[PDB]
């Protein structure tokens, strides 16, 4: 269907403990494929999915080069912004960036993005037209000026439209057997008695990809979320995901309940019962 590539940059200062640490991670869809950590004994851009390992020496040195320039750029960014806000020399501060692109089922540019955050809140973002900026505050406006007078917008658009999309498609082709493949959740229901009168029924979805999924409980055929305990969808560590939803029910009434699971990997919605 539709696809995305995204890069996440984070720079966090540590006054009295060294120079700002810089970390980057790249994603295609829900799949991380690259990483960089300034604190690594030998900082380099490293592969996190089989289908990038094939990239040649010139790729990895170019990426490593880019990340080292990145850490320098964001270090300046932190220092400059720290000046804008006239903050105390005290504690840590953070500068984050997420950028990348969405391509439709046709393989064309749907939307490009490139937004920055300072200390966990929007700071400045490239608007959907890839030509203007939204400054979240007085300081970000100063930055806006600098970027407009430097023509940063055009530079970003050139990459978001061309390079970003091309390579996204490339990675998509190169990793097709996993990126364009959906794994269906393996589902079951567990039984946990609380007392002689109440028991918990937990409905599990394990080993699925992608992350997006839906779990719900029904009584006699009619919903009843408000009574349902979820956990946030979590990563198994094997690139797949997990989730459960539970409901406390009267001992003896287990039959009345059915768990319902919808996921891209299932031909048709599934129905479980204890």
């Amino acid at each position: 269907g539709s696809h995305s590539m995204r890069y996440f940059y984070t720079a966090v200062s540590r006054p009295g403990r060294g120079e700002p640490r810089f970390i980057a991670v790249g994603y295609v869809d829900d799949t991380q494929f690259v990483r960089f950590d300034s604190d690594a004994a030998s900082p380099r851009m490293e592969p996190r999915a089989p289908w990038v390992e094939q990239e040649g020496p010139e790729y990895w040195e170019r990426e490593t080069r880019n990340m080292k320039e990145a850490t320098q750029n964001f270090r300046v960014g932190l220092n400059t912004l720290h000046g804008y806000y006239n903050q105390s020399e005290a504690g840590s501060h953070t500068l984050q960036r997420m950028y990348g692109c969405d391509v439709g089922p046709d393989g064309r540019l749907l939307r490009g993005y490139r937004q920055d955050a300072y200390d966990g809140a929007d700071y400045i973002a490239l608007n959907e037209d890839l030509r203007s900026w939204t400054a979240a505050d007085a300081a970000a406006q100063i930055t806006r000026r600098k970027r407009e007078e430097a023509g940063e917008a055009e530079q970003c658009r050139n990459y978001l439209e061309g390079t970003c999309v091309e390579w996204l498609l490339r990675y998509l082709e190169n990793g097709n057997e996993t990126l364009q493949r959906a794994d269906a959740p393996k589902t079951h229901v567990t039984h946990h008695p609380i007392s002689d009168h109440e028991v918990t029924l937990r409905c599990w979805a394990l080993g699925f990809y992608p992350e997006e999924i839906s779990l719900s409980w029904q009584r006699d055929g009619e919903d009843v979320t408000q009574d349902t305990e979820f956990v946030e969808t979590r990563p198994a560590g094997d690139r797949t995901f997990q989730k459960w939803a539970a409901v406390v029910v009267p001992s003896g009434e287990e039959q009345r309940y059915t768990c319902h699971v919808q996921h891209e990997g299932l031909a048709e919605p599934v129905t479980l019962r204890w």
Binding site: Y7, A24, G26, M45, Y59, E63, N66, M67, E69, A70, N73, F74, V76, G77, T80, L81, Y99, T143, K146, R147, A150, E152, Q155, C156, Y159, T163, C164, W167
Partner: peptide
């Protein structure tokens, strides 16, 4: 492929 444009703040 990461982006290699100049940054300003």
């Amino acid at each position: 492929c990461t982006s290699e444009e100049m940054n300003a703040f």
